[model samples]
Target: AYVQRGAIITSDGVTLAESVKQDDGTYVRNYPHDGMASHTVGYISTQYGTAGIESSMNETLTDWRSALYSMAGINTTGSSVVLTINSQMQAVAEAALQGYSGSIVVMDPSTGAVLAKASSPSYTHAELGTIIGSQLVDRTTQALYSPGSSFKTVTLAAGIDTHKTTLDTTYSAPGTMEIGGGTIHNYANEDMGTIPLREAFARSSNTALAQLGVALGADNLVSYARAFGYGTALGQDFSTTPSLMPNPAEMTTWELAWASCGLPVGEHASPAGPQTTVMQNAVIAAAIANGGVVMNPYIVDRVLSPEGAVVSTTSPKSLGQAVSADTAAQVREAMLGVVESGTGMGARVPGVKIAGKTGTADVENGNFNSFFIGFAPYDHPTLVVSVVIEGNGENVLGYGAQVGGRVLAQCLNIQAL
Candidate 1:
């Protein structure tokens, strides 16, 4: 019996995998890049069935209706699945993430097109059985982290959107402030003193955020967070964990204060609780980049027939407005301050005005998960990117922000120093 199998191609129409018939008429699968894209393309095997695009689009790949077309003498080949991911950008992201035990996600904020979804500690299809842990997992969307100060952007947005605070609204941010019987300290106990809200946000003052949390109250903060895509699915084509935000009604005053800073507190204060994923943080950045509009992110850009005809294409879809345009503009300016001379300075590019936020969440063994989320050319935003480096306590070296800068510059095709 003769059997035909379809091939999988990239956005640029480059075939990454295919089936080749042997002399005995049996077919064997071939992957050109080995395990580089194993997580995205997935694997196909007799015992393991199929995965990733193979399993998701199996009908198009195998062409269950192809036999009918074959009987009609019209050649039938499995339709091609084309993703929005750019191969070069993907490689650059993957390279930048090297030596880090985390993930990177890049997206077109205006169109919601995913440019790269790179995860480290990945394995090839052939090595699936040998892998015993979570190396096979795609941390970009699957894994969650505390998100640290990066979530302050949400607090800032809430303050601005509700007209409770402005860039010039001054607040006294001490190194440490007692809130609801608990003390919240700035990163490393930096005493910012009395400063504008913009400075407080740019400096990532946990005390300032906690103050804002209390001033804005838990309801407004939680509502604004949900508007920013927290506690909701990002609406990706693939599986993704929603970024979580505990209900303010159920949270104590202290928990709400810590939650505003993206810190784990109250009941779920343990290290093993829920957290934010890289993709979720990227969406937050994208929403700011896209003028408060949260675009629905997508990976598979289109599908093509074997005959080189376009079968389907994706159109930009909006996930509603997260905040007002004016509010977003103010928030963007504050984020710009972050890159220009604040906590996210490591993500600054010489010629580009990058808006960003840096984060460091403590994990286990005194390790910290370093994070940076930003978008470049601040005037006309193109890409929103997020990078996380696991186990880099407080990232005193700003390695995560540096990686984010490099990836953003490369993805945006900008020259670097």
Candidate 2:
């Protein structure tokens, strides 16, 4: 005999998945959302085992619980899980990500509620036979990429927080800077002339920021990275890969300079500093939007008993301050400059103050991963978005930022921009 099963539903009670018995006394899981949530909803297979939510919440969905006497112990009828996901937002993220093979993570910065986490090239549970390795990967939390210029936000935070550099501080932006016997140049080796730190950031001057990185020193850079939620797992309800950053004490001078600008040197194309996910970048933006506090990101919001009674819910939790409130405000304003007239101008939404940063990192295949991290309504952020479009070729610089803007507009129901 088989134990009773409960359905997995959305916040609005739309059933996403359910267990159905076959004529042979075996159980087959079915998904209503199909490939839309394949990676997140996961799948249960007799041959391959469980994955995603099916695996993470197996106990809750399989163990029975009484509504009236919920604490009374396990039963046969399992409880259903209500996710924090907004179907519309999830759909928008996937749709905006069309033409790309990467991921997008959207969240409510204040509450740490994951509004949407979508990975491209998804396969439905029924199509498991056709699933290839990493096709089912949750790029939102799994894939790591060099943050590129978006990481400049972290460098800037370190600079300002440690009182190493100010917005007005000027730096010479030559076409290239030679450090440790290697030449690192600005994008395309363009000379930016002498400019303020603020303008250098707005223009996404690689050479300028790399210089800033060396000045800030490796110790300070790595220290702020941890404060901003790198080098640690996010403790999400689902599986998550921790963002990686090398120990500052262990890095050489050349590595530190390159890491400050979010890339690697002298070792082929891999980033020598840190590797992060779209989820972490989003949290980085959230920390700035929330005044330096990093909120714990979550997907499942509550658990419902078989009888439709609530079993448990998630509350917003803080991972503590990443920087001072003043420092956060400073970074926020600098990011605003990025979108206002900087490299992230493509991410601007009309009638809305969007703050963001753009990043491009070389991948192993000689292509680049385009990245964008930002939040909107400037003074009062409602949604913070992070996007990465991998291996889109070197020419497509703003693709990630463009995708982020469109998705955020849809989530906020803004028609323009």
Candidate 3:
């Protein structure tokens, strides 16, 4: 039977799914939450591969949709798959996009539970079977780009953890660096000379970070990064890509120097190749927020079995202690400085402690990508957020701190769960 146009599926008589035939008399099922929870509820079809929870627990969803209400299957038709997605924040991500091209991921750092995951311009998996735009390809987790300066959070953590640099430790930079025949530049190429480590980070100085990386060297940088979960898979719920990781084989005294400049291998791709994954980078950011231990990242909180029993649950697993609690505190102090009086001025929230970092990747075709990653209530973070926007190379607006700052602010505005 051809599902009639305007037909609906309901939960308590409230439409949960809808349909509209297209130009060729074909019908389409409007899967709910495509824009807000495409990464959660997922899609299904015979032609295209399934996704999200549908992909994770395919057998579980299959029986339910087919109305298989067996004891160990759909189970009397009341079985449900509870998610960690916060409805309010999900709406917030959709609003934040304002019809743009980008993605946002929010999670509970301590537990690795993904609170909100949204991709702007997200299409229904139903459309995946017929429509194919590059945009249809999931960009949040699948699309890769240079993280620009937001990645400094990982670099900074690695530097501090390796150096054991105290919160008050000082470093020097001239605001510009010469890396492998190319001039590594800072924002407007301004110089800040000698300043405290925290001050350098607050300024988002490319020169400072590059210099710090050089001082730390390849081995120490590599080791600390590995500890930070770089160059490794996070094994998250939905498919996750690793962040740009440092590659030792390609390291020359010069390349490693520029690698500090955030222009090396995997620099502009998913976090998996020779660099940290976004989940891992976010984890590193959250670790600083959580006092230095890199916690795992996940989406589904737990899975239930067919017999109304818990099949699995996520817990706080250390991805190897990337930094000491003391080191984490030091980095936290620095990130707080950014939120307090630096590039991250947009991130502050009243009555709640906010510590964060702003990152602007090197301009591609004249526009820079903006990024911000941080956690709330600096003393004790309950949530971690990562936000990025593709700058058209024509508009010069906010950087990572500002992009992430705005998103983090909205996330913080969420009623405490």
Candidate 4:
């Protein structure tokens, strides 16, 4: 009397994990792609228990009491789940972050389906589930990271909505400026003299955004932060870490400015600085790509019976609009400027209209974290990829953008060097 387990399949019809009956009257779980999608198709260990999708959809994959009634012995197999992710995309994403401890999240802007989700420190089926923490953590959903300049996207949307700034808004941005006792400095201490908001956004000028932040004030920033899926639950079936947002109503000059820029202020940084997971970051970009509407992200596409009959299909759902079409369009154009002639040039793909933002965060030991959030073929936006290379990455600042560009290209089926 063996319980034939179901299979966990991919959107492209590739079987990722399946249960094969063994010679000893037991079933062995097989992973066809090895560890390509370790985070997505987690191993099923009776000893260590299941993780990720395996644990979340355990009942779906194993329950077949209803189907077994009329068929008796013939209805022994369980249903197979079809996920939205493509194994090919998973392979490329896994390869991109092979040696690094970071994360990559690829989403369909229109559908909010996770095309590929990879967390570094990946392990194959060998000794699967024998360990926990560090390598076991899914950086995409569990790890919290300072989004750095990428959070500026949220600030820019707030600026536009409050009518405090626009593409044509002009500001005098120096290399460094003092905010009360705290000081704001541009990355690498570069000065823009005076420039438009669009250019400042593209160049990622901290001094400029700090000024806009002070002008917009803390109330507006807090309001927008809550609006952009910060406090709400994101993942459909699997749970994700909540994005930590600061809400200091009354702030000192520097405190407001630093919080506005989504950075830690003062020599001794505050513990409650803005933080987000890779999944939420992709939702931010996907909201912009989906015309300012934030769609709830989901991975499971549908469930199919062992006989290839459709069990249940998942439909795309929205979490409401975060910004106006007008605000969304202007910000998108500014992000396009980031790729056209700004910090995100590394994320540009030839002949494709790409809108993107690059972010860097400071960590302990003088190490830093890097981020790139972008979507391509700007006219008809579809694919959104959010990348973060934790700790010390190769080439430091370029890793996130380069990795994002490469993954975006692969998702689009375009050639990228």
Candidate 5:
């Protein structure tokens, strides 16, 4: 099922609805843009509808017994999910999704406390099971799309970890490359000759990533990709579909090359059943965001009883330290460079040191999933967010960074408030 397009309200206070005929003649009440971030938040249809937090934290959010909701006259205690999400940033995400089809997910890569996971063309969850038109689709996690260019972010990690590439590492993109016996062409066949690693990332050159993957060899690329979370279930402790990636045994040079450019090859198995622990993607991002120390992401910061007594407290544990602190710093520096002057320019918030990556995965013809992953106050970060927008067909200019930046700006504003 696909989510409704016009049932969204941007954080900036925009709403969409049918045109009305008044004494002033037929007119449409403009609400920013219609069908913005619908896929991110997703739509709730008759058959089935669930997405974003709606799907992620269903038990706590839905069950009256959980400590999720704070009622007016009732005092309930169970567990509290203290997220790093900034309300203002959510507004920015809404504003950015105005008239676009995409989603935004902002989470502290370290804690995995999602600040805001917004999607374009979003419908009202309050009206679940009654939505009409298109069916409900959890575009954020369900909608499998080609993550154009943004795959480079993960590719960089792969390259560095496997091939020992550096920020100054040079690669070449001739607007086209051959891999997996398939002809790979860059966006609009744009060629920029020999380019540095940073430059390639800044420009979001597909050819560069493809070529880099090829140069790095299949095994090396696959190694890093596996090290990161790909061809695997996200293992989120909720009922939802996680992004899938190819397995190492079946990976080929061409397939690795394809993933290098943000597209997975082959079918994704159900990850051999449920995982015992749910902490991989968050730890990966945390390692990158925290200069390589992958902190275990937790939802329960503390569990308090109705009397405000400490029932249980979450301990900040370190997952397997994947990369060295030096490697993490290098990755951070390169990522910071992305927001500072590269493809992630849209994520920059004035007076806030923000670092992040953007992804625009082509879901289908005329539709794309735009993503922005970042954290603010780069030097000493407190919160991180990832924004993904599903098929609103509004990113004609391919300006994912702007969308990410707008949401990030809102997040920063929320912090200020």
Candidate 6:
């Protein structure tokens, strides 16, 4: 009994996936736009089965009929699934990700609407099923990676929120320092000695933030991390893998220091470094931009009847505040510095002030990945883009910065009032 599958569309009403009645009376699922969003518009194949929304919303797509209709043996049709993805920006997101194997996610800071989500090199349904290193991996929410210094946003936010530190709080930053029995190293190995937290964050100082994390106390830091959606599922419609952070109670001073700045710890530094997905990073940027409240991220907007009537809709929801408004403001300014004159200069958009943090992620057995996680427009921000480029070696141009910068620039220009 092959029921007609429901259509999946972007916010702009561009159909991504739909089922069409064939000459043989078979309902065949077809993807338009040449299958641009491979992950979100997952496939329904008789041979390989379903994935993504094709899997998540399968029941409704095939069997959303009234009980009377079911008993009466009437035609059982499915409703269309409307998503928050803007097709125009979706294309832009994928265009920016061309030739890259990483992921890019953009969200509306205030509403948590996923404006665009592009996981590069859209593979065929056969590729997703036949393997070749698991094509089903949705880098935005499935594949996990170390947050690198991008995670220092958590440490800084914790410090500023607890009144334990401030933008002007001083620390004698060293190129290398013994903390909790292990040494903490700074990025570029620059000592920058005795700078305020403001500069520490702007420069992406690993040792300085490590010290700040320590001063904030391990337990306090972990609790704050939890508040930011760590160790908790951050997405509902899509299977968003909850990010991982080591328990402070189980950490030594050395491990705590490393974890503070998003580094691996333990023997051989094997296993466990703060793990996050592109989605979580986007949420992090949005939380900071939206006055510390991490809104519930949503891709599906509503379910529409076959006749184009709205059957169900999704409302923008809040996951509660992650930090106080005052703390978010302080952190936003520091991030501004990152794009203004610090490591994130590559992410700057002329005439538009962008706030961001750039991270060189330490990957196991591989060259580090680069990440640019932040938002734009400075005041009353509307966009949050998180870009991660696989392997710093391949990202010689540091495309992470370029991707975030370009995406924000074009998106801001398009959404220009």
> Which structure among the candidates has the greatest lDDT?
6
Off by over 4 Å in 5: 1-92, 129-136, 231-240, 265-285, 295-300, 316-319
Candidate 6 segments exceeding 4 Å error:
45-49, 63-73, 125-134, 266-271, 392-397
Model 2 spans > 4 angstroms off? 21-27, 46-49, 63-75, 130-133, 265-271, 392-394, 414-417
Please provide, for model 2 over 30-126, each residue's C-alpha lDDT reduced to its tens digit, 9 standing for 90 to 100.
7887877677788777755677788888898872454435333334567888888878788898888776688999899897888888898677776
User: Quick one: ranking by lDDT, best first?
Assistant: 6, 4, 2, 1, 3, 5
Superior candidate under lDDT, 3 versus 4 = 4
Candidate 6 TM-score versus the reference:
0.93
Could you give me the TM-score of model 4 versus the true structure? 0.91
lDDT of 5 by residue, 88-178 (tens): 5555666666676555565565655544545445665444535451425543445455555555666777667654688788878778877
TM-score to true structure, per model: 0.90, 0.91, 0.81, 0.91, 0.71, 0.93
Better of 1 and 4 by lDDT: 4
Worst 10 residues of 1 by lDDT: 68-77
The residue-by-residue lDDT of candidate 3 on 74-181, one tens digit each, is 122222345666677766766776656666777777766766676767765556667462455555566566665666666677777776464467766676777656
Q: List model 6 lDDT by residue over 1-417, tens digit each.
A: 356778999888898888887676567777777557888888766665666787888877774555443332247678889989988888889999877778999999998899899886567654644645144568888888888888899999999999988999898888999898778888767889899989988988888999888888778878888788888777667778888777666767887788888775744332365788889899989999999998879889999988899998988988889999999999999999988988888888788999998888766565678888889899989899998888635544356888899999888876774
Tell me the lDDT of model 4 at 397.
72
Error of 2 at 232 (Å): 1.4
Off by over 4 Å in 3: 1-30, 46-48, 63-79, 179-182, 265-277, 305-312, 394-396
> Which residue ranges in model 4 land beyond 4 Å of their true spot?
44-49, 63-76, 129-133, 250-253, 265-271, 393-395, 414-417
Of the two candidates 1 and 3, the one with more favorable lDDT, higher being better, is 1
**Residue 10 C-alpha lDDT in model 1:** 69
Q: Mind sharing the TM-score for model 5?
A: 0.71
